């Protein structure tokens, strides 16, 4: 009984793109438990992220179009679901890393309040790692594939535009952030046998992937994350100089956009995107850099615990 498949997954919002196109929130789910079965997952190769990318491109260009008027934009949780015939099933292993067999598997129909927010380097407003901090990668061995660390406790961040001036800033508690940073350092040591760890700024080039780029309440902020990735951390409140730039390069596809001519965002940091490097002498140290690039990763970070299949 049952086999993996593909299906134009529908959506349930709890609304008050989710206008008519998403059904009201199911106010009574039913994760029905499954037993004696050890199913294999591949967060890195499912089409839930394909569906998700195409749908969010639709909503993205629809609601904040490039030049171009000015109205609100903040995401709201949007469950996804399978129609009759097809089953989402759910890995409930607290320490499942995205790839491989899960035994505490149980099936249900709608996801969990997915907040479709796209970002770089740092992951925002998502669901935390249930038990201990998780590190997700298609293979730790090959470095071209990026790393998605998923935090145990989230860290809030405040980005602010104040007077009508040129650019903006952003603030973070150095205390808890450097604590959780050393926590993930300990974990990365665990998987690379107690090796010394080194954070460094991104290589450069495509501004967005060498910056913390994200759209807050209509406008795009680029925060210099050189401070957050300090090797030697000095634990006072940390400031970031963030560029609110009117010219962007489009995550939509090939092309670049411009958006027309007192605002604030608070957000939880739930994950980080990190690229390794290449130590052939292996040093006694591995170095990590803030990553990003393919928007695809953003969705895997939240759809690792699920798989769409067909009931037979």
């Amino acid at each position, epitope marked *: 009984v049952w086999k993996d498949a593909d299906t134009t997954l529908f959506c349930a919002s709890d609304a008050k793109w989710a206008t008519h196109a998403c*059904v009201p929130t199911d106010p009574n789910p039913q994760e029905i438990h499954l037993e004696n079965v050890t199913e294999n997952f591949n967060m890195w190769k499912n089409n839930m992220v394909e569906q998700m990318q195409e749908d969010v491109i639709s909503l993205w260009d629809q609601s904040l179009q490039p030049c171009c008027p000015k109205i609100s934009f903040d995401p709201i949780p949007i469950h996804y679901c399978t129609p009759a015939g097809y089953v989402i099933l759910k890995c409930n292993d607290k320490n499942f890393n995205g790839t491989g067999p899960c035994k505490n598997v149980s*099936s249900v129909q709608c996801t969990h309040g997915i907040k479709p927010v796209v970002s770089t380097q740092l992951l925002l407003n998502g669901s935390l790692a249930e038990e201990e901090i998780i590190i997700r990668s298609e293979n730790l061995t090959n470095n071209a594939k990026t790393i998605i660390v998923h935090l145990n406790k989230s860290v809030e961040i405040n980005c602010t535009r104040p007077g009508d001036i040129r650019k903006a800033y952003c603030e973070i508690n150095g205390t808890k952030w450097n604590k959780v940073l050393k926590q993930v350092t300990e974990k990365l040591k665990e998987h690379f046998n107690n090796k010394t760890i080194i954070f460094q700024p991104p290589s450069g080039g495509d501004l967005e992937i060498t910056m913390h780029s994200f759209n807050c309440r209509g406008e795009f902020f680029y925060c210099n994350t050189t401070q957050l990735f300090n090797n030697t951390c000095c634990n006072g409140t940390i400031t970031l100089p963030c560029k609110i730039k009117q010219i962007i390069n489009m995550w939509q596809g090939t092309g670049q956009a411009m958006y027309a001519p007192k605002i604030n965002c608070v957000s939880n940091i739930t994950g980080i995107l990190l690229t390794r490097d290449g130590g052939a002498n292996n040093t006694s140290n591995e170095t990590f850099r803030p990553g990003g690039g393919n928007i695809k990763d953003n969705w895997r970070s939240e759809l690792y615990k699920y798989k769409v299949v067909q009931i037979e």
Partner: antibody
Amino acid sequence: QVQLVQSGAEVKKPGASVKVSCKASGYIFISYFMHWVRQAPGQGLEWMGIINPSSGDTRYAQKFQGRVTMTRDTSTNTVYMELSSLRSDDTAVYYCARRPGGLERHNWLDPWGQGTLVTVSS
Amino acid sequence: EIVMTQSPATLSVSPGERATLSCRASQSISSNLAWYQQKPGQAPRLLIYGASTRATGTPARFSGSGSGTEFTLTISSLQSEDFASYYCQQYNNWPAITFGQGTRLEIKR
């Protein structure tokens, strides 16, 4: 197996309230939601509400928000429906039902209590 | 928000004819739905679930296409058993399990 048993017919005066039971049998009482629907000849059927006999959670149809309430006694595995402020046009037959199946979800109303009739008269 | 609408309210057909019902959904309930049957005097019987599949325990004269917004139910070679009322059923919006006003059917004998 899949077997529901409701209460009998009942007549209690207008402006009052009534309680109709529904004993489920042939499956664990608690993992399956109990739904209540009603029929008054002159119209067809319409859904009234959802109870989770694992929680106590109730979500209702708009028209019946307030008048109807649901209850569990998950031990003698029965569900209680309670309608109140019985105006003269609530007189009708009321059915309880389940959402059978196996795995996944797909909750189609399989077993169906034979329905009790409620004549609000004087 | 998701208004369901039956197709004909009443029906009159002769034995052996074709009968067709439609269930129109004002919004994508996404290919769930279920068709039920109630004879005068008895407890409604489900005929189809998952929009399309016959519930083993009903004859193959019944069927139901749709997938998405518009749905249909077809009775081929309708017989004397069929003369009753039929209904359609949302149920993916877990609680919003809402009916249509129904479709009574009757004989031309």
